[model samples]
Target: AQVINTFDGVADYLQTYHKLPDNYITKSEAQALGWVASKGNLADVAPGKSIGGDIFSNREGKLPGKSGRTWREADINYTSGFRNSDRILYSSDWLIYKTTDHYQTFTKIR
Candidate 1:
């Protein structure tokens, strides 16, 4: 399996797969599969699923964010066995940001 925790990994995955890859799952998809962030049992309710996609709530509207037009997110480099605090905020138009401490900070990838 490919570890997509880093900026390069995510970019590579996008280029190769044209999608967010296996390490991620949209909140709705996870919810359909019985995932609950409130419960924090994504791994318990849904095996092999990580909370991701359609997933950025920019309520703060501050700090590092996604692309020029769109702002979506993915929980990259997450291990199915445990929760990963890392994620990539992105947009389909080609904006990319990596955050290892949840969404507190970000690093540029594109």
Candidate 2:
């Protein structure tokens, strides 16, 4: 159970484990723990937990995609306060990508 929360860390971790780090929580999970999405108060509600494990719809088609491939996203380099645009996108097929400017652009990391 590693607590990695960086772009490379999460990407490498997912490449190896096919899952998010221990510190990651889905939006629903975080919300249930009193997390306020608008306020970006994950730190106040769930300290040290990063948002992750939610399906990443390739709406923009920014990353490579194929039929039956499901993608998941995780926050990277998140500590507290407002969450940055950094994110790690990984697929069920083991493909990994990173987006520093939210989902507007992406880079294949693995």
Candidate 3:
């Protein structure tokens, strides 16, 4: 299967399929299977799978504020070893943004 490892790839997948790629698993789901966040050992527990689809509270309010707006996260450009700080934030209403610096700033993807 092809790996969706790019910002545009993930964003397009979410928009087209209304879900993450086949290789993505939620943090909670990954944890149950022995994936560790600090250790970055997802590859050991679940090879070829990346962390994604977890809720993002937007507490810092970096994103647009709207009533009942919910956000979900997905790792971006991830492949092997330790995961990078890059991530893609997608919302229930089709908003997608990419953050390369651990949420310091976001670049709108859609």
Best by lDDT: 3
Highest TM-score against the true fold, candidate: 3
Candidate 2: the clashing residue pairs are: none
Task: Give one digit per residue, the lDDT tens place, for model 3 in 20-57.
Answer: 87788887888899788778798899888788888878
* lDDT per model vs. reference: 0.68, 0.83, 0.85
Worst 10 residues of 2 by lDDT: 13-22
Better of 1 and 2 by TM-score: 2
**Candidate 3 Cα deviation (angstroms), residue 17:** 1.4
lDDT of 2 at 77: 86
Stronger candidate by lDDT (1 vs 3): 3
lDDT tens digits by residue: candidate 1, 1-110: 64455567777777676677666666778778777677778878776656656757666664444445556777666656545667777766666777789777777777
RMSD of each: 3.2, 1.5, 1.3
Give a tens-digit lDDT track for model 2, residues 1-110: 55789888777777787677678788899878888888878899888777888888987788888768878888888888666798888888888888899888888778
In order of TM-score, best first, we have: 3, 2, 1
Candidate 2 lDDT at 63 equals 82
At residue 16, what lDDT does model 3 achieve? Answer: 95
- Give each model a TM-score: 0.71, 0.91, 0.92
